[PDB]
């Protein structure tokens, strides 16, 4: 459903590897909004159809980069 994960994006440092995440996730059937900040390390994406797949993570691994929680709270 519309269910947007906001998180920090780890190992990030160079190349097209940032927005090449968003442009790959644009093929996920549950994609309804993507944004990444290649200066303050966040992504925000809702990308979940019928369910939440591990493809949520795979589409960061494809960049050389890892998914982590942003947090205090």
Curated annotation (Swiss-Prot):
Compartment(s) where it occurs, according to its Swiss-Prot or TrEMBL record: Cell membrane
Residues of the HMA domain: 3-68
Top-level lineage group: Bacteria
Cytoplasmic side: 1-73
Residue sites binding a metal cation per the record: 14, 17
Function field: May play a role in the osmotic adaptation.
Record-stated family: Belongs to the cation transport ATPase (P-type) (TC 3.A.3) family. Type IB subfamily.
Protein's recorded name: Probable copper-transporting ATPase PacS
Encoding gene per record: pacS
Full-sequence portion shown in this chain: 1 to 73 of 745
């Amino acid at each position: 459903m519309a269910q947007t994960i906001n998180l920090q994006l780890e190992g990030m440092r160079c190349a097209a590897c940032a927005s090449s995440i968003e442009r790959a996730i644009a093929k996920v059937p549950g994609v309804q909004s993507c944004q990444v900040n290649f200066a303050l390390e966040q992504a925000v994406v809702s990308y979940h159809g019928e369910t939440t797949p591990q493809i949520l993570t795979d589409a960061v691994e494809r960049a050389g980069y890892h998914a982590r929680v942003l947090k205090q709270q």
